[PDB]
Symmetry: D2
């Protein structure tokens, strides 16, 4: 249902990154970042149900992944604490966006898979 999905992996332990906090913001008319959607990744490392086609309108979006809470519960104090990426949602473009991310204490990688 959700045209925005987030999937997070762990490069140190070779696993889905479970219980990772993900926050999505949408740029408002005044150019502030408005809270749009948020959630936590499941046991699969996937975060479903973030939003819907009705709510996910055209706009500039920021996807933030908080790595601090995640690493600490696994006994790690990371260097990279959060990572954020910004993109524009455009109705002419294909309709499902998957933001994949890979976490390590000193490294962050993300790739967008845009389908349909």
């Amino acid at each position: 249902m959700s045209p925005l999905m987030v999937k997070v992996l762990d490069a140190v332990r070779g696993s889905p990154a479970i219980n990772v906090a993900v926050h999505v913001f949408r740029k408002a008319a005044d150019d502030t970042w408005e809270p749009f959607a948020s959630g936590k990744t499941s046991e699969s490392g996937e975060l479903h149900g973030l939003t819907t086609e009705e709510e996910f309108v055209e706009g500039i979006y920021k996807v933030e992944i908080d790595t601090k809470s995640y690493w600490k519960a696994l006994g790690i104090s990371p260097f990279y604490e959060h990572a954020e990426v910004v993109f524009t949602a455009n109705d002419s473009g294909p309709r499902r966006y998957t933001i994949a991310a890979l976490l390590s204490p000193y490294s962050y990688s993300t790739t967008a898979v845009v389908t349909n």
Copy 2:
């Protein structure tokens, strides 16, 4: 001289990412992001002279790399427009931080190399 350095690479063309705008922010007491330092990468993809040991105090820092202006001048309209990473500078930790980044239209990777 600068205890913070940024180096940016291009995954599509296999080159240093030249003339990439980099902005650094430092979290203020009120928890807003204060502009701390900024610059553009050289022909080597490296950004030197960002700050000094005197100015780079302990704190939470955000490093933002704007990919839009970079890709457009190379004739590309990217999906990922900006990428940001947050870390804490701590005086007890080693004293030089190098933030390396790799750019592609739909992908972003960064790693911190912390030495001395």
Copy 3:
């Protein structure tokens, strides 16, 4: 069914990497690389049915992804032509391995997700 799965993504076009040739080798007693399994990624970028629990015994495995044929059909002549990674399968370890890969003309990234 397959305890080994391969998933491939495209960093330039932001998509599953479809029709990517994947070859798996297993190190033999004489220390040569014996052809073990191979296939092509589906429209999802995923390669299923590579092997079975009966055939996927303990051993040293190499997973090779050929990027040349893939990029050319998309009109690209890449610099990185193939990428290979080696790991040991061990029965005591968890039983499903997913090798994820991200492709660009001058860059290659892979991460293993080992579950169950």
Copy 4:
């Protein structure tokens, strides 16, 4: 002097990957991989002096990085044991190749920077 350089980083500890064994092979006329050059990364994570312009002729090259010996001495038993990438050296192309790599126990990333 060397038109081929290799630089290796560590994503777990946020450092240059020091004393990493790097092996380069060149495809022979019979299509076997002939040992071409090898070395170990310095304290900077860089491997200089691999070859020379006279020896580095046109051909298909494989760059292998052995991660097992590296991780073990740091007290880690990695999943990814080696990673290899293949490219063609072509005299018409620019003349310096830098192969950068990023290591983690379950992840490997590499990018080529081709200059001059």
